Paper text:
Within collagen's trademark triple-helical structure, three polyproline II helices are stitched together by a network of interstrand hydrogen bonding along the central axis of the right-handed triple helix.
In addition, we have reported two new collagen crystal structures, with the first structure of a collagen triple helix containing a peptoid residue. This prevents the NH backbone–water interaction from occurring and better protects the Gly Cα from solvent exposure, with the nearest water being positioned approximately 3.7 Å away from the backbone NH and approximately 3.5 Å away from the Gly Cα. If there is any other residue present in the Xaa position, this average drops to 3.4 ± 0.2 Å. These observations are consistent with our structures, with the NmetG residue blocking solvent to a greater extent than the Val residue. Averaging φ angles of Gly residues from collagen structures in the PDB gives a value of −69 ± 5° while averaging ψ angles gives a value of −176 ± 5° or 173 ± 5°.32 In our structure, the Gly residues adjacent to the Xaa NmetG residue adopt conformations closely matching the PDB average Gly (φ, ψ) angles with average values of (−68°, 176°). Comparing these angles to other structures in the PDB, the Gly residues next to NmetG adopt conformations similar to those adopted by Gly residues adjacent to either Pro or Hyp residues.
Residue numbers in the entry:
A (entry chain A): 1 to 26
B (entry chain B), C (entry chain C): 2 to 27
């Protein structure tokens, strides 16, 4: 029969950097 | 011996990215 | 029984990071 199911793949790579912060105070 | 087992599932989503750059001057 | 299946593929890229730090004062 078929062998045991394989291991789960690796976690994906880190997401991209976030957007820019809000503008500073007036 | 039988054929190789079914392939494992895909990994989970990666970790979130880092924070974005500093915002613009007020 | 056959050999265990191959490891799954890498997961999706992680989510985008958070917002950056607030910008400097006007």
């Amino acid at each position: 029969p078929p062998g045991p199911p394989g291991p789960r793949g690796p976690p994906g790579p880190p997401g991209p950097p976030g957007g820019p912060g809000p503008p500073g105070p007036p």
